[PDB]
Amino acid sequence: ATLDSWLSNEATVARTAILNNIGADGAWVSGADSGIVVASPSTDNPDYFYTWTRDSGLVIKTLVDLFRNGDTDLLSTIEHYISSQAIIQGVSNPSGDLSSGGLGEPKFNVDETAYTGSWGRPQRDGPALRATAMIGFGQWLLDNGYTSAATEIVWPLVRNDLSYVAQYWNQTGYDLWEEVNGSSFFTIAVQHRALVEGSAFATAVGSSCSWCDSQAPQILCYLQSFWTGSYILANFDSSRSGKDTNTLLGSIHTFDPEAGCDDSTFQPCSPRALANHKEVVDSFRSIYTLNDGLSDSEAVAVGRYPEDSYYNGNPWFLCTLAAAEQLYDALYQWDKQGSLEITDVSLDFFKALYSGAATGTYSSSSSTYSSIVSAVKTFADGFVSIVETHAASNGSLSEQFDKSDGDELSARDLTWSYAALLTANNRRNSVVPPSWGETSASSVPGTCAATSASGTYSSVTVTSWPSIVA
Numbered sequence: 001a002t003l004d005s006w007l008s009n010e011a012t013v014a015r016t017a018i019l020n021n022i023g024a025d026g027a028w029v030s031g032a033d034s035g036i037v038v039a040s041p042s043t044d045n046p047d048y049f050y051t052w053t054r055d056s057g058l059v060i061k062t063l064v065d066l067f068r069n070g071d072t073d074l075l076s077t078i079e080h081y082i083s084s085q086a087i088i089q090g091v092s093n094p095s096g097d098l099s100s101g102g103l104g105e106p107k108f109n110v111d112e113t114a115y116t117g118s119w120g121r122p123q124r125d126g127p128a129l130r131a132t133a134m135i136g137f138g139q140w141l142l143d144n145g146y147t148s149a150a151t152e153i154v155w156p157l158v159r160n161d162l163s164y165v166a167q168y169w170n171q172t173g174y175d176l177w178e179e180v181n182g183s184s185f186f187t188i189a190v191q192h193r194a195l196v197e198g199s200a201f202a203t204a205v206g207s208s209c210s211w212c213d214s215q216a217p218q219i220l221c222y223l224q225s226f227w228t229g230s231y232i233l234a235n236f237d238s239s240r241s242g243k244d245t246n247t248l249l250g251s252i253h254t255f256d257p258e259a260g261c262d263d264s265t266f267q268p269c270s271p272r273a274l275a276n277h278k279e280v281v282d283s284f285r286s287i288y289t290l291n292d293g294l295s296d297s298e299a300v301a302v303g304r305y306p307e308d309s310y311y312n313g314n315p316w317f318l319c320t321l322a323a324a325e326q327l328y329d330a331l332y333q334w335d336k337q338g339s340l341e342i343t344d345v346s347l348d349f350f351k352a353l354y355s356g357a358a359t360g361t362y363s364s365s366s367s368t369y370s371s372i373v374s375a376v377k378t379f380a381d382g383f384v385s386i387v388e389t390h391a392a393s394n395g396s397l398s399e400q401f402d403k404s405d406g407d408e409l410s411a412r413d414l415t416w417s418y419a420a421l422l423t424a425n426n427r428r429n430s431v432v433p434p435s436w437g438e439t440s441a442s443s444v445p446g447t448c449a450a451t452s453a454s455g456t457y458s459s460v461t462v463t464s465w466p467s468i469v470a
């Protein structure tokens with residue numbers, strides 16, 4: 001009504017805003033090299049005028065999906081990003097060089113020089129998020145007959161990042177929020193994913209990734225430890241409750257449209273992810289005044305973790321959108337399957353939205369199913385309205401929105417906010433991402449081993465891009 005139309009306008013504003021934040025033509029980020037994704041044009045309070053491997057990887061993956069669906073104009077953007085990464089990989093920084101840990105460096109200056117001050121480094125998700133983004137583009141190239149571009153440019157780039165993942169997964173580092181030195185759900189989840197699709201990608205170009213194959217099952221094994229019995233623990237080595245939107249992100253960024261409600265990979269419709277969803281969201285109901293008076297069956301403003309004190313601890317646009325996106329994803333999964341199941345694990349999730357919820361299997365033609373799917377859609381859309389209510393009048397999406405009055409705060413025009421909007425909207429519309437092979441990578445080994453595999457490192461030089469026509 002308002003929502004459908006706002007979303008439609010907002011998607012268009014988000015696509016533009018992201019482009020304004022990518023060099024060397026990006027209107028808001030003059031100074032940024034070619035294919036460099038800037039986190040935000042805010043150069044002071046806070047200073048976000050840097051390129052993070054995570055934000056960039058997440059943003060480009062989004063644009064690659066848009067591109068595969070017909071937004072052909074994004075081609076040059078993706079090519080420039082690929083070329084920029086050929087360079088960054090080789091940049092010597094506080095985390096090391098290409099073959100000695102450099103790949104793990106969190107952020108860089110927009111000019112492609114290293115950031116040398118103190119930072120929570122390394123962040124092991126980066127390499128995995130970059131590989132995922134590149135593999136998508138690489139797949140398109142193979143499908144459209146640009147085999148050479150896939151085999152000689154993309155593959156070797158990906159091969160570097162996959163090698164980092166297989167080698168250091170089993171080592172502590174910082175979480176996506178760059179504050180906890182330990183082992184993080186999000187990181188492990190995206191790492192498992194990357195190796196699985198990394199392996200399929202290697203086979204497609206006529207090469208192999210033995211280190212992908214030997215480590216993915218072990219990463220999966222370890223992931224299981226994050227299930228506490230009632231929710232997903234955001235991090236090992238933390239003194240907090242462990243309720244964190246990090247776990248929602250892990251699920252949506254590892255969603256496979258071909259997967260069932262698999263618990264071992266924490267899919268969106270899995271009992272564990274649904275139980276988790278309620279625990280996380282509920283953790284923000286009583287700490288934000290903006291949430292005052294809402295009931296348990298209503299959407300609330302979501303932040304990162306309940307203990308957060310960054311800018312005083314406020315809801316984040318991307319965290320609120322992730323809460324919605326997981327539901328969109330589960331809805332799609334249930335529809336595709338033709339049923340939904342309520343277990344003891346997911347009962348509270350369902351019961352809060354539909355008081356008549358009881359364990360059992362509900363076929364898609366059943367009354368219970370209709371009742372539940374409507375409640376779920378309504379709830380999901382409700383998080384989106386919170387976003388809509390606090391977005392700026394011209395559509396500007398900030399990092400945070402005040403916990404008391406909803407005014408935008410922290411970094412303005414955060415690229416990540418814009419990407420999160422794009423994906424929540426796609427999912428809402430049933431536009432899902434290419435599958436990553438989850439259906440052959442959900443079997444958990446009987447015994448988990450604390451291990452690694454060492455792959456191979458080689459500097460890539462992008463001398464020329466074929467003249468691709470989309």
Ligand SMILES: *[C@@H]1O[C@H](CO)[C@@H](O[C@@H]2O[C@H](CO)[C@@H](O[C@@H]3O[C@H](CO[C@H]4O[C@H](CO)[C@@H](O)[C@H](O[C@H]5O[C@H](CO)[C@@H](O)[C@H](O)[C@@H]5O)[C@@H]4O)[C@@H](O)[C@H](O[C@H]4O[C@H](CO)[C@@H](O)[C@H](O)[C@@H]4O[C@H]4O[C@H](CO)[C@@H](O)[C@H](O)[C@@H]4O[C@H]4O[C@H](CO)[C@@H](O)[C@H](O)[C@@H]4O)[C@@H]3O)[C@H](O)[C@H]2NC(C)=O)[C@H](O)[C@H]1NC(C)=O
Pocket residue numbers: 013017027028029030031041042043044045046049392394395396408409410411412413
């Ligand atoms: C919807 O409408 C919105 C409202 O109009 C619109 O947002 C506005 O967009 C303009 C850009 O078109 C923004 O202008 C910038 O303002 C900067 C100063 O901001 C402070 O002061 C403002 C006024 O008092 C505040 O409004 C502003 O608050 C906002 O930002 C806060 C911080 O993130 C946030 O918390 C608030 O909630 C609020 O959102 C903030 O307090 C100003 O610095 C900046 O100037 C730079 O860029 C100009 C060109 O784009 C240059 O001409 C200028 O010389 C400056 O360039 C420097 O910085 C650039 C990066 O931004 C670099 O590209 C340049 O190379 C250069 O950098 C050098 O200097 C740096 C030193 O710190 C250094 O680090 C660099 O390495 C380099 O050496 C610009 O004028 C305006 O802030 C926005 N207003 C608001 C309220 O957000 C929005 O974009 C519209 N959205 C859509 C979707 O259309």
Ligand SMILES: *[C@@H]1O[C@H](CO)[C@@H](O[C@@H]2O[C@H](CO)[C@@H](O[C@@H]3O[C@H](CO)[C@@H](O)[C@H](O[C@H]4O[C@H](CO)[C@@H](O)[C@H](O)[C@@H]4O[C@H]4O[C@H](CO)[C@@H](O)[C@H](O)[C@@H]4O)[C@@H]3O)[C@H](O)[C@H]2NC(C)=O)[C@H](O)[C@H]1NC(C)=O
Pocket residue numbers: 169170171172182183221222224225226227228229233235236237238239242448449450451
């Ligand atoms: C490298 O790989 C190996 C192999 O996979 C990893 O080893 C596994 O590590 C996990 C995590 O430590 C470990 O699981 C723990 O088992 C203990 C007993 O067997 C449990 O007591 C412990 O409980 C915590 O987590 C539960 C969820 O699993 C929570 O329900 C519970 O509340 C506990 O959580 C609190 O306490 C922890 C302290 O550990 C704290 O950090 C939390 O934040 C929270 O406050 C775990 O379940 C496996 O048994 C190990 N497996 C093997 C085969 O040895 C290793 O961790 C990897 N290393 C890195 C750095 O990646």
Ligand SMILES: *[C@H]1O[C@H](CO)[C@@H](O)[C@H](O)[C@@H]1O
Pocket residue numbers: 262438439440441442443
């Ligand atoms: C995930 O993958 C495993 C095999 O790796 C399947 O057994 C499971 O059903 C799901 O498809």
Ligand SMILES: *[C@H]1O[C@H](CO)[C@@H](O)[C@H](O)[C@@H]1O
Pocket residue numbers: 217440441442443444445446
């Ligand atoms: C399912 O498959 C995995 C490998 O993907 C095995 O490790 C597991 O033991 C089960 O056979």
Ligand SMILES: *[C@H]1O[C@H](CO)[C@@H](O)[C@H](O)[C@@H]1O
Pocket residue numbers: 449450451452453
């Ligand atoms: C970690 O352990 C595995 C299996 O136990 C080895 O194959 C690997 O090489 C590393 O030593």
Ligand SMILES: *[C@H]1O[C@H](CO)[C@@H](O)[C@H](O)[C@@H]1O
Pocket residue numbers: 167168450451452453454
């Ligand atoms: C990853 O780390 C393991 C340690 O378990 C080594 O055996 C391997 O060679 C690589 O360094």
Ligand SMILES: *[C@H]1O[C@H](CO)[C@@H](O)[C@H](O)[C@@H]1O
Pocket residue numbers: 099167453454455456457
């Ligand atoms: C892991 O170890 C192998 C073998 O020593 C190297 O070739 C690789 O670069 C990484 O250091």
Ligand SMILES: *[C@H]1O[C@H](CO)[C@@H](O)[C@H](O)[C@@H]1O
Pocket residue numbers: 455456457458
């Ligand atoms: C690891 O393997 C790659 C691919 O064969 C080599 O090019 C690299 O130099 C290292 O030996």
Ligand SMILES: *[C@H]1O[C@H](CO)[C@@H](O)[C@H](O)[C@@H]1O
Pocket residue numbers: 156457458459460461
């Ligand atoms: C390792 O592999 C890269 C990518 O093919 C080469 O550019 C490099 O010379 C080395 O052989």
Ligand SMILES: *[C@H]1O[C@H](CO)[C@@H](O)[C@H](O)[C@@H]1O
Pocket residue numbers: 086087088089090091098458459460461
């Ligand atoms: C690979 O790494 C070398 C440095 O070893 C760079 O010079 C090259 O541009 C690429 O990044």
Ligand SMILES: *[C@H]1O[C@H](CO)[C@@H](O)[C@H](O)[C@@H]1O
Pocket residue numbers: 458459460461462
């Ligand atoms: C790409 O190739 C050039 C040589 O053509 C190297 O110097 C660079 O380090 C990377 O291997």
Ligand SMILES: *[C@H]1O[C@H](CO)[C@@H](O)[C@H](O)[C@@H]1O
Pocket residue numbers: 152461462463464
């Ligand atoms: C230019 O040079 C690079 C590396 O030196 C090649 O891999 C590329 O395909 C082109 O020939």
Ligand SMILES: OC[C@H]1NC[C@H](O)[C@@H](O)[C@@H]1O
Pocket residue numbers: 039048052054055176177178414416
């Ligand atoms: O957007 C830049 C940077 N800001 C702070 C966030 O915690 C982190 O995830 C992000 O990469």
Ligand SMILES: OC[C@H]1NC[C@H](O)[C@@H](O)[C@@H]1O
Pocket residue numbers: 176177178179310
């Ligand atoms: O104030 C700590 C702050 N530092 C830097 C990180 O970007 C952010 O996630 C964290 O909350």
